Design a binder for these strands. Structure first.
Ligand SMILES: [Zn+2]
Lengths: 171, 67, 148, 52, 191, 121
RNA sequence: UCAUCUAGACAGCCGGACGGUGGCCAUGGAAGUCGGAAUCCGCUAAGGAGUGUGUAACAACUCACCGGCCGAAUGAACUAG
């Protein structure tokens, strides 16, 4: 859906042999708290020997964007499962916030590789603080000095089923 | 004689271009394009008309001849 | 007037070259054999200068030949046609002498360089009691003066 | 005998070509893929067989 | 990958004048005039300083930016064809039967006729496209020269004359007979 | 690696400019490596010959521009195939040797820079 | 995933592409190019004890390397929609 980012902090259940476990923390892009906690336990079952019955979640907090009106370039490292194997990819997206960047990332992977939400693993997402570290041409195209371009062929959708003059596509 | 072309200029999108919000919650106010996200969407701001600073798809605004 | 150069194992085709110069093959061979005095045992470049009557034979200096000669070699019949792999002592003085003998002929870049090139020429020869030929040439500055 | 230069000029159009191994198409001599759809633009090409 | 702006340039010499309404190009020079419809290719033209014209495409795909350099080459070919002209020299190649080429007139249409190509009784006639002048050149044996403004018309007429002399049911690596284009250049080459 | 080799070139050039007051710019066309090698040997004692990519050289001179400002005048002359001769001998003797050697069917000295002064010669 | 890149990259033209040295065995010969091993120096801006054509062996031509013009990304191998 429209994604939100949460921090989820959890731990193992405390025993007498070891009280105070190590309080692992992860950042999850998810639609809501339930999906966020499910993905948290999914990745902790991939990492450490723990499961939901043997552990607990001590905190979940929404992390909204610090500057939601700054235009950033993000580099995203992703695992995905194809029909024959597992691959790593690095894609970079020029967008205004992290949740919108990963939303366009999920759309991009589903469009160009037919990869689903169950197949995509988000390794990391990070803002590229400096230009000329941008490595893709499709985003390096929009970083030029005095960028301007026209929008040819305007199509205006009509409300009536009949129009009384030939329309114009000037913009 | 001299060479003649038909120029055919139209309404470039760049910073400082004044746009009119076509549909949405503003829906009829003016804004100024602050920056260009990509080919299809831009970051605008309309601070006199009460339009909050936001990223918006270019299909939801109409570009005006004002710069 | 005409100079012809051939690589000849000593003690000895030649005739084909000789016919153009109208010189007897046997006479040329005898002259070459005498010149091979330098070594004969091994192949060496021989320069024949033709005066339009007779050809004079001299042995032009060659790095491989000089190096092979320097390595002490028991005379080989070559009927065996054995590999005859050449093993040699360091012979640092001989190589320096060889570099001096070259005397930067054909413009060797430096006196030290001429020696280094001479060392490289010993691809065939071991050229050292315990080392790869010219391996230590970069390491040691000794003998630079000797080559000059 | 034609002439040597004129044989060269005629052989430029008739003999200095390549042949697709799949669909026998006569192709440019420096080509990498066949221009035909029916072989699927394959890169199995051979030189056209000369005389002599 | 949707290149948002790609752009080529064409240089306009002192003698020519180029008129571009919507996508119809008219080039007028010393040797005459030429025109071209380009409403199928969807580019935009812009005169800079009366000797430079930029052609551009915005938000174009790979095929579209290929077509941009194609249309630049076409209009530049038109400009250099109305300035210098275009001249194709072709040579006659035969083994035994000499090829006898003349110019005839069925209903005033300037046909080029080809006789005795490999000794046949059939007479091959190729029509001549307008604007193309054909001269049977002296001082070089068996050479024909086609000149004009349009590279399309000149090279197509030369190609029709080449294709009309194809050999059937024989090994064509041995039967090399025909009429082949040997030189392509300008009428005022090395100007 | 590539940069390292390049860095060495920049350094040697700077040293050469400092070492010799007299600079000869020589243009080489159709000169064989063997032809070049012979010239180098003849002039080994009194002259230094340097060959390099022009793009590389121009940047170096601009980099070393603050010191040795007069060398800036040499930059217009650098265009085209060029070689640099650094020599103790003031002028004609070096020039005579370069032109004469290895003329076959051809080294030419395009310009001479000595002591901040440029001579067409 | 490797490499090259405004200190000038990849295409296209143009120039050089050298000495020790005909490196060592082996052959009637094989000198970079029938093979077996080694495969190193000098001069370098740069040039392999050779990429092919190439001759009985040469000679000759071309390469991969460096240079002028060009001024900005490109080459190889692989993966999957
Ligand atoms: Zn095919």
């Amino acid at each position: 859906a429209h994604f939100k980012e949460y921090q989820v902090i959890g731990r193992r259940l405390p025993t007498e042999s070891v009280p105070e476990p190590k309080l692992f923390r992860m950042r999850i892009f998810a639609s809501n708290e339930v999906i966020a906690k499910s993905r948290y336990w999914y990745f902790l079952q991939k990492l450490h020997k723990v499961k939901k019955a043997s552990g607990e979640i001590v905190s979940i907090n929404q992390i909204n964007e610090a500057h939601p009106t700054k235009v950033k370039n993000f580099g995203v490292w992703v695992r995905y499962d194809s029909r024959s194997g597992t691959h790593n990819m690095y894609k970079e997206i020029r967008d205004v916030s992290r949740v919108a960047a990963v939303e366009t990332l999920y759309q991009d992977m589903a469009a160009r590789h037919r990869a689903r939400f169950r197949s995509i693993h988000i390794l990391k997402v990070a803002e590229i603080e400096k230009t000329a570290d941008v490595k893709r041409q499709y985003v390096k195209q929009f970083l030029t000095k005095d960028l301007k371009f026209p929008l040819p062929h305007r199509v205006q959708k009509s409300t009536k089923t009949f129009s009384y003059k030939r329309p114009s596509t000037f913009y | 004689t001299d060479s003649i072309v038909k120029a055919s200029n139209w309404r470039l999108v760049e910073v400082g271009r004044v746009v009119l919000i076509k549909k949405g919650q503003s829906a009829g106010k003016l804004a100024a394009i602050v920056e260009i996200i990509d080919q299809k969407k831009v970051l605008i701001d309309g601070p006199k008309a009460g339009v909050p600073r936001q990223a918006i798809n270019l299909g939801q605004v109409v570009l005006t001849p004002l710069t | 007037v005409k100079y012809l150069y051939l690589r000849a194992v000593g003690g000895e085709l030649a005739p084909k070259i000789g016919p153009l110069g109208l010189s007897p093959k046997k006479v040329g061979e005898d002259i070459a054999k005498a010149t091979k005095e330098f070594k004969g045992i091994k192949v060496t470049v021989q320069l024949k200068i033709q005066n339009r009557q007779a050809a004079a034979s001299v042995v032009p200096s060659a790095s491989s030949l000089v190096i092979t000669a320097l390595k002490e070699p028991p005379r080989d019949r070559k009927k065996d046609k054995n590999v005859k792999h050449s093993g040699n002592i360091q012979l640092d003085e001989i190589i320096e002498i060889a570099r001096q003998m070259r005397d930067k002929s054909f413009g060797r870049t430096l006196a030290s360089v001429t020696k280094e090139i001479l060392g490289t020429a010993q691809s065939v020869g071991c050229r050292v009691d315990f080392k790869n030929p010219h391996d230590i040439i970069e390491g040691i500055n000794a003998g630079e003066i000797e080559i000059p | 005998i034609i002439e040597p230069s004129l044989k060269a000029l005629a052989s430029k159009y008739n003999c200095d070509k390549s042949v697709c191994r799949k669909c026998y198409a006569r192709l440019p001599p420096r080509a990498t893929n066949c221009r035909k759809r029916k072989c699927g633009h394959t890169n199995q090409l051979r030189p056209k067989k000369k005389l002599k | 990958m949707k290149y948002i702006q790609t752009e080529q340039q064409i240089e306009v010499p002192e003698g020519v004048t180029v008129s571009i309404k919507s996508r119809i190009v008219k080039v007028v020079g010393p040797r005459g005039t030429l025109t071209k419809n380009l409403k199928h290719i969807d580019v935009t033209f812009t005169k800079v300083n009366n000797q430079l014209i930029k052609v551009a495409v915005h938000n174009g795909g790979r095929k579209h930016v290929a077509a941009l350099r194609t249309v630049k080459s076409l209009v530049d070919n038109m400009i250099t064809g109305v300035t210098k002209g275009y001249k194709y020299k072709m040579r006659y190649v035969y083994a035994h039967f000499p090829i006898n080429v003349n110019i005839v007139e069925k209903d005033g249409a300037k046909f080029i006729e080809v006789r005795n190509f490999l000794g046949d009784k059939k007479i091959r006639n190729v029509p001549v496209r307008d604007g193309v002048t054909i001269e049977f050149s002296t001082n070089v044996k068996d050479e024909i020269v086609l000149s004009g403004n349009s590279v399309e018309d000149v090279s197509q007429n030369a190609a029709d004359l080449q294709q009309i002399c194809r050999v059937r049911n024989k090994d064509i690596r041995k039967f090399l007979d025909g009429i082949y284009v040997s030189h392509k250049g300008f009428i005022t080459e090395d100007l | 690696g590539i940069r390292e080799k390049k860095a060495e070139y920049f350094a040697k050039l700077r040293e050469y400019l400092e070492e010799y007051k007299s600079l000869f710019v020589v243009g080489v066309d159709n000169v064989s490596s063997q032809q070049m090698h012979e010239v180098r040997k003849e002039l080994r004692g009194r002259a230094v010959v340097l060959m390099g990519k022009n793009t590389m050289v121009r940047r170096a001179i601009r980099g070393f521009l603050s010191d040795l400002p007069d060398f800036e005048k040499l930059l217009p002359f650098v265009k085209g195939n060029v070689g640099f001769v650094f020599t103790n001998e003031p002028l004609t003797e070096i020039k005579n040797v370069i032109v004469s050697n290895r003329v076959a069917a051809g080294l030419t000295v395009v310009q001479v820079y000595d002591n901040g002064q440029v001579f067409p010669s």
